[PDB]
């Protein structure tokens, strides 16, 4: 009967925990037309977590967006230590404007 519907009522409702220690690196992600998002992770940790968080924050999808480092395609699997990610670095990302029909 030409029926249909949609929900997807999930804005990535979750939190995280870290430790107090200057043994981590922060990277400035650029995407918005005037907004930078920082991220504190370990040198032996897969960006996977970092990226994922970058999405939930803006409520976007990993696919919709893309990450990069020094003009190169990075994979969540890869680590910040492999690319020699120094302290106070900057990540490359493209934030596209795609409004959604459903709300959180």
From Swiss-Prot:
InterPro entries: Rad60/SUMO-like_dom, Ubiquitin-like_dom, Ubiquitin-like_domsf. GO terms for cellular component: GABA-ergic synapse; glutamatergic synapse; hippocampal mossy fiber to CA3 synapse; nucleoplasm; nucleus; PML body; postsynaptic cytosol; presynaptic cytosol. The keyword Acetylation applies. GO terms for molecular function: protein tag activity; RNA binding; SUMO transferase activity; ubiquitin protein ligase binding; ubiquitin-like protein ligase binding. There is a cross-link at residue 18 (Glycyl lysine isopeptide (Lys-Gly) (interchain with G-Cter in ubiquitin)). Transmembrane segments: none annotated. GO terms for biological process: positive regulation of proteasomal ubiquitin-dependent protein catabolic process; positive regulation of transcription by RNA polymerase II; protein sumoylation. This is Small ubiquitin-related modifier 2. It comes from Homo sapiens.
